[PDB]
Amino acid sequence: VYADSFVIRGDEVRQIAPGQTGKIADYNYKLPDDFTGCVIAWNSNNLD
Amino acid sequence: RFASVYAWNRKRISNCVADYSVLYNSASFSTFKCYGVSPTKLNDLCFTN
Amino acid sequence: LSRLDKVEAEVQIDRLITGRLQSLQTYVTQQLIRAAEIRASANLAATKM
Amino acid sequence: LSRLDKVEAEVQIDRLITGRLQSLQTYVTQQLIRAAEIRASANLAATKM
Numbered sequence A: 001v002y003a004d005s006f007v008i009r010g011d012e013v014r015q016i017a018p019g020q021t022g023k024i025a026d027y028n029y030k031l032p033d034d035f036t037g038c039v040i041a042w043n044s045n046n047l048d
Numbered sequence B: 001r002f003a004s005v006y007a008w009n010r011k012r013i014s015n016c017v018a019d020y021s022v023l024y025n026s027a028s029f030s031t032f033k034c035y036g037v038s039p040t041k042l043n044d045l046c047f048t049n
Numbered sequence C, D: 001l002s003r004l005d006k007v008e009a010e011v012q013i014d015r016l017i018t019g020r021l022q023s024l025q026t027y028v029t030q031q032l033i034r035a036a037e038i039r040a041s042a043n044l045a046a047t048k049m
């Protein structure tokens, strides 16, 4: 179980899903289109 | 100023080259949902209008 | 495959595959039924010979 | 078609069309196989006549 963690600006959380494309999915981190796994995201303005 | 939604402003972009990558790379576009075509390939197509 | 990217194209391709493969299964079934009819005619022709 | 509008109904219709069309292809295939059996019996009857 690889756990991969990073930060992204709120409305870009849509980009992460498998088969998406755009700034994160194109140039930073892409999920495989047959990904088995879970994407966990939560607000961090209280910290970051 | 844009149009109001009831009277949408329509412009024919035609007889011109269009790189859609420079659109899609704009961090402004919170929504860029496409149908029947995928953004990664738009530059491989040409369209009648 | 020019318009769409793989994750969407796979759904479109699967529908053409389904219909093209069902067209072929219909063809090969029909040719098997009709080949049995020709072999009946060939056995009859051999007997008449 | 009383419950749903077109964009949703078309998926529901496609499922019924698939299953109803496969029902007919099963019928017509089996009726062809069984028609060959009748034609064998008819040729035997003609020969016995």
Ligand SMILES: *[C@@H]1O[C@H](CO)[C@@H](O[C@@H]2O[C@H](CO)[C@@H](O)[C@H](O)[C@H]2NC(C)=O)[C@H](O)[C@H]1NC(C)=O
Residues within 6 Å of the ligand: B022, B023, B025, B026, B027
């Ligand atoms: C609308 O105006 C903006 C600001 O003048 C243009 O912004 C450029 O957009 C491209 C594509 O994302 C970037 O590569 C440039 O770096 C941007 N320039 C600046 C100064 O921010 C934008 O090009 C214009 N819209 C269109 C469709 O051309």
